[PDB]
């Protein structure tokens, strides 16, 4: 005998004889127990079916719960009943065959040709075979006579749920399961396989129930919750109801009674069987046991998101895992996670003792479960476990171990774990991290690791899993490490990169006017691992001064060249070449930063074709990780060495600006009033293709938008060109031009669903305005700023405009989840073969070559096989 | 006869023949291939033997 | 359960939820038969 694997599953309909022969007992009695005697013979709780309480031996097999599979029973039904789930099939078995001779009502020769074609095409073209059988069924149903026996056939109409009423030249006759089974028993095997069925495994008369299988107790365990009487589940109650109806019908028919009550009781028994197979039958009253609640049956046992498929098969609860709130930690590497001591001493990893790591494991064993690092259990080679909590003296036990033992030690530094944040939209939402144990109670994540997880520290929690096998750990370390996944697969560009304080610090350190003394340089460089020769100061006299670019240049490789603009080169700083009075153009030659600043366009995350992107692409994720660990901390250190605050004086504008804003607003209002006044007397030439009352709204919206833009420009011009808010806006750290415009100048026009606010009273939004007023103020134009403050109706209009954001989020996330689930299930089984083709696991070909040139998006230079201009730059950029 | 013999990793570094014979005659109650394949979840090597 | 002692049985490791699914499928009239295969791939 050999250990095997599951290679396939063959389905079918379970034969009544097979049910009889697989069963161990026959259920005869109708009481579940007597005087709490559940081992009562012949009941549903007969011990021969199975055992569920801890201490007991199964009568059928001398095994306990550890090795006792459930055993099935059989109930001999006296009146045949029909399966509710199979009705449609037997429906197609009634309208497509003769009632008397039990044969298909298609003539002989064409039927033989059809079956020959079907057998010749059944396996190669399953869809064509399905079309053929459906066509045969359609053309056989529409025949009212049987050529084989020369008899005239009536028609049968289906009535929900399970009763078939045939028409027989008037006086519609209700059909009984016995005659239906007799009719279906006559269909030959050669004709039942022509209809798309299997005679040797799914025989139609087996589809009519004569013997019912009784599931074991292991499938329907008795629950003794609430510290009271044991509460049986729905299956036992429905089964015993079916049994008692069976004996009632048997005794009633054997005693003699009118056939009307007999058939009514037969219908009731059929109802019990149907509600046992499935409770939520449309148009039927659900069964309720004692509390007026609908029962849960076999169909309900496999349904929803809490059933078997989506509750215990597709997804399941696993151990060796934890969930905890996350907090920032900029002192960790980009592939490290900080865990508390309590979790480290609870989750363990099993390490097998060898001749190389025996002293370390002995030291682990010497420390108890309560001392870190330590161990919790020791597994002997025999397979028995020893708990270190109850060990009398583990000091000698540590010396007693040899190679072959297994020790469950605590998590230590350098251990590989899986770190995850739901909803897990894409593949890098779950990554392999290295453990570091720190005091506290939260998981610690580096600030650069947030974008892949889409996490921010507003109270989010994340999950941690500990692989427990050598192969799983090796795969996680070699394929799922964080630093190996800097570039996202959606496009060619880094997903891990500079955030918000990093960009501001980089800009402030890289600017032309930064000069540092020796002590300041030492303080800045003390946070990194750099030690060595600083070189001569950039400025020698009168006072020895370094510079920000010189400190930055200590980390770039000595053959790196880069020419490109910065994020601050959008406004009046655009010099479009190397001769720039501003630091608006980046020039790096042979690893020396000669001019330009660092901002979002040089170190920012999700910025393809930046200097960070090329640096990673040319010096590996190794240099990418080293750079992100070293140079990104000087930015924070210099930011806190300098001062970075936000004062209210960065938003206030001088009173001379407010007068110009007011004049512009008055001009715009006068223009709108002129439009409206001339609209009331015709005098308007509408935009071609548009009607009156549609051109007026367009004119008003256009002039209001132009007024908003002009006011924003005026506010920006008269503000301080170098303040913290403007710096954050231009460098791309936080904010935008629109936010600055709204804070310093007028908010603009509020709109709901792309149109001005109109819902309210008749011909007016609020009761503060005149009837039929379409002035800019009356429809939601805010002429104030957040700094200046809003009037009450402006507050109302702002809230009305902004309400949509609080609503759209749930709809968006639900639709995205549904679409992604369908798309995943559609594209799950595709693979790339060794010849470059894209093929499904079933063999068929999707693409002759992946993409068009077999290039991975992750390894591409922003959706491009290779940037030839970048190569020319990399070669000869030091002499451009 | 033709069969498959499993060689545990602890017996590595030695010629296949004697180990193959040892496990063959150890539990039953020959030129084996010098190379064998590895399956998922087990480190032992499976060799084809003509015994 | 049907062949008694006239058949050879093989052990397979599997998720217990799958075995529960098989058992509750046999509770209905569906009969799922598992086809076994060799653990070791010959060649």
């Amino acid at each position: 005998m050999s250990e095997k694997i599951i290679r396939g599953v063959k389905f079918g309909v379970l034969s009544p004889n097979e049910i009889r022969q697989m069963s161990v007992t026959a259920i005869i009695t109708s009481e579940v127990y007597d005087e709490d005697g559940t081992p009562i013979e012949g009941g549903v709780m007969d011990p021969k079916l199975g055992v569920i309480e801890p201490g007991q031996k199964c009568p059928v097999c001398g095994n306990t719960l550890a090795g006792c599979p459930g055993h099935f029973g059989h109930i001999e039904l006296i009146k045949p009943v029909i399966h509710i789930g199979y009705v449609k099939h037997i429906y197609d078995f009634l309208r497509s065959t003769c009632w008397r001779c039990g044969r298909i009502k298609i003539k002989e020769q064409d039927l033989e040709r059809y079956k020959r074609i079907y057998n010749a095409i059944k396996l190669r073209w399953p869809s064509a075979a399905r079309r053929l059988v459906e066509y045969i069924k359609k053309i056989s149903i529409k025949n009212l006579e049987c050529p084989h026996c020369g008899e005239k056939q009536f028609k049968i109409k289906l009535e929900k749920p399970y009763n078939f009423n045939e028409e027989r030249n008037g006086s519609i006759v209700k059909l009984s399961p016995s005659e239906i089974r007799d009719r279906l028993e006559r269909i030959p095997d050669s004709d039942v396989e022509l209809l798309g069925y299997d005679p040797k495994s799914s025989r139609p008369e087996w589809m009519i129930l004569t013997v019912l299988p009784v599931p074991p107790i292991t499938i329907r365990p008795s629950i003794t919750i609430e510290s009271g009487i044991r509460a049986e589940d729905d299956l036992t109650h429905k089964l015993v109801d079916i049994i008692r109806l069976n004996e009632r019908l048997k005794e009633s028919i054997e005693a003699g009674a009118p056939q009307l009550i007999i058939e009514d009781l037969w219908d009731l028994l059929q109802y019990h069987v149907a509600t046992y197979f499935d409770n939520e039958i449309p148009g039927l009253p659900p069964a309720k046991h004692r509390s007026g609640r609908p029962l849960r049956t076999l169909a309900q046992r496999l349904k929803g998101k809490e059933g078997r498929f989506r509750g215990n098969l597709s997804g399941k609860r696993v151990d060796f895992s934890a969930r905890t709130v996350i907090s920032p930690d900029p002192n960790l590497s980009i592939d490290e996670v900080g865990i508390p001591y309590t979790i480290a001493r609870m989750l363990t990893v099993p390490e097998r003792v060898t001749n190389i790591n025996i002293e370390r494991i002995r030291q682990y064993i010497i420390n108890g479960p309560d001392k870190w690092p330590g161990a919790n259990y020791v597994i002997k080679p025999d397979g028995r476990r020893i708990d270190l909590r109850y060990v009398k003296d583990r000091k000698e036990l540590a010396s007693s171990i040899t190679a072959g033992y297994v020790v469950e030690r605590h998590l230590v530094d350098g251990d590989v774990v899986l770190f995850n944040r739901q909803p897990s939209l894409h593949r890098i939402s779950m990554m392999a991290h290295k453990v570091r144990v720190l005091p506290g109670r939260t998981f610690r994540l580096n600030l650069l690791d947030c974008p892949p997880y889409n996490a921010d520290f507003d109270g989010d929690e994340m999950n941690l899993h500990v692989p427990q096998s050598e192969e799983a750990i090796a795969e996680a370390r070699e394929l799922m490490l964080v630093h190996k996944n800097i570039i996202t697969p959606r496009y060619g560009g880094p997903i891990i990169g500079g955030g918000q304080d990093y960009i501001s610090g980089a800009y402030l350190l890289s600017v032309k006017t930064t000069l540092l003394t020796v002590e300041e340089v030492a303080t800045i460089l003390g946070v990194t691992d750099f030690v060595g020769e600083l070189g001569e100061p950039a400025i020698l006299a009168p006072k020895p001064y370094y510079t920000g670019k010189q400190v930055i240049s200590l980390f770039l490789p000595k053959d790196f060249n880069f020419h490109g603009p910065a994020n601050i080169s959008k406004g009046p700083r655009a010099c479009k070449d190397e001769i720039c009075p501003h630091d608006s153009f980046i020039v790096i030659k042979n690893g020396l930063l000669l001019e330009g600043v660092f901002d979002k366009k040089a170190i920012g995350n999700q910025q393809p074709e930046s200097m960070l992107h090329w640096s990673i692409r040319e010096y590996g994720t190794e240099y990418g990780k080293w750079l992100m660990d070293n140079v990104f901390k000087m930015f924070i250190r210099f930011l806190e060495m300098r001062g970075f605050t936000m004062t209210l004086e960065d938003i206030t504008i001088p009173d001379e600006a407010q007068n110009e804003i007011t004049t512009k607003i008055k001009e715009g209002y006068s223009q709108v009033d002129e439009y409206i006044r001339k609209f009331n007397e015709g005098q308007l030439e509408p935009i071609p293709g548009r009607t009156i009352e549609e051109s007026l709204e367009s004119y008003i919206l256009d002039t209001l938008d132009k007024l908003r833009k002009v006011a924003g420009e005026i506010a920006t011009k008269y503000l301080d060109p170098f303040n913290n808010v403007y710096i954050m806006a231009i460098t791309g750290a936080r904010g935008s031009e629109l936010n600055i415009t709204q804070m310093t100048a007028l908010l603009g026009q509020q709109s709901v669903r792309g149109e001005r606010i109109r819902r309210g009273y008749r011909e007016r939004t609020l009761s503060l305005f005149k009837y039929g007023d379409i002035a800019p103020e009356a429809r939601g134009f805010v002429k104030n700023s957040f700094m200046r403050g809003l009037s009450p109706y402006e507050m109302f209009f702002h809230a009305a405009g902004g309400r949509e954001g609080l609503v759209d989020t749930a709809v968006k996330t639900s639709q995205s989840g549904y679409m992604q689930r369908r798309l995943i299930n559609a594209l799950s089984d595709l693979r790339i073969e060794y010849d470059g083709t894209v093929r499904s696991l079933y063999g068929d070909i999707v693409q002759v070559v992946y993409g068009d040139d077999a290039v991975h998006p992750m390894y591409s230079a922003h959706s491009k096989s290779v940037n030839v201009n970048r190569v020319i730059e990399r070669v000869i950029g030091w002499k451009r | 006869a033709k069969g498959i013999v499993r060689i545990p990793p602890e017996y590595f570094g030695q010629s296949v023949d004697e180990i193959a014979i040892k496990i063959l005659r150890q539990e039953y109650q020959a030129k084996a291939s010098e190379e064998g394949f590895i399956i998922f979840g087990d480190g032992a090597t499976y060799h084809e033997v003509e015994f | 359960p049907v062949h008694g002692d006239k058949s050879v049985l093989h052990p397979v490791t599997v998720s217990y939820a799958f075995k529960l699914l098989i058992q509750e499928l046999m509770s209905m009239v569906i009969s799922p038969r598992l086809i076994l295969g060799e653990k070791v791939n010959l060649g």
């Binding site: 050999s2 250990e3 | 006869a1 069969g3 498959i4 499976y46 | 070791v40």
Partner: peptide, 7 residues
Amino acid sequence: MSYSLKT
């Protein structure tokens, strides 16, 4: 551990 022995 399997054999797949045949004669």
